[PDB]
Enzyme design. Structure first.
Site, PDB file in Angstrom:
ATOM      1  CG  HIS A  37      -1.838  -0.973   1.490  1.00 33.32           C
ATOM      2  ND1 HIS A  37      -2.948  -1.189   0.663  1.00 33.32           N
ATOM      3  CD2 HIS A  37      -1.947  -1.866   2.521  1.00 33.32           C
ATOM      4  CE1 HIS A  37      -3.648  -2.210   1.173  1.00 33.32           C
ATOM      5  NE2 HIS A  37      -3.085  -2.613   2.303  1.00 33.32           N
ATOM      6  CG  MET A  92      -6.987   1.789   0.481  1.00 32.51           C
ATOM      7  SD  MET A  92      -5.826   0.418   0.655  1.00 32.51           S
ATOM      8  CE  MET A  92      -5.034   1.047   2.172  1.00 32.51           C
TER       9      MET A  92
HETATM   10 CU   LIG Z   1      -3.569  -0.143  -0.868  1.00 37.14          CU
END
Ligand SMILES: [Cu+2]
Length: 99
Positions: A37, A92
């Protein structure tokens, strides 16, 4: 404030994703599940005059392992939208208000 990168069920989310802080307060983003991420502030959706590069990872930078962090403190007042670049379309994304 602490923010998880990925929920504990593997969902591709910041937890929490919407929140408010005071100027100079740190946000600690912690790699949790579903990584890699990153956290990128949207240069067109943060307060005027703020340098996105002072407060963001680049889109090419990643946290690849569990427990890694990115910390940032925001001072200028207003709304800041941010996202995880490889997971943005999955949802996200988040918004922090400095008030
Ligand atoms: Cu992510």
């Amino acid at each position: 404030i602490d923010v998880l990168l990925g929920a504990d069920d593997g969902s591709l989310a910041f937890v929490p994703s919407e929140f408010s802080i005071s100027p100079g307060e740190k946000i600690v983003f912690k790699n949790n599940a579903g990584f890699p991420h990153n956290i990128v502030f949207d240069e067109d959706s943060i307060p005027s005059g703020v340098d996105a590069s002072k407060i963001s990872m680049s889109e090419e930078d990643l946290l690849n392992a569990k427990g890694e962090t990115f910390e940032v403190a925001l001072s200028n007042k207003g709304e800041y939208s941010f996202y995880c670049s490889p997971h943005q379309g999955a949802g996200m994304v988040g918004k922090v208000t400095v008030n």
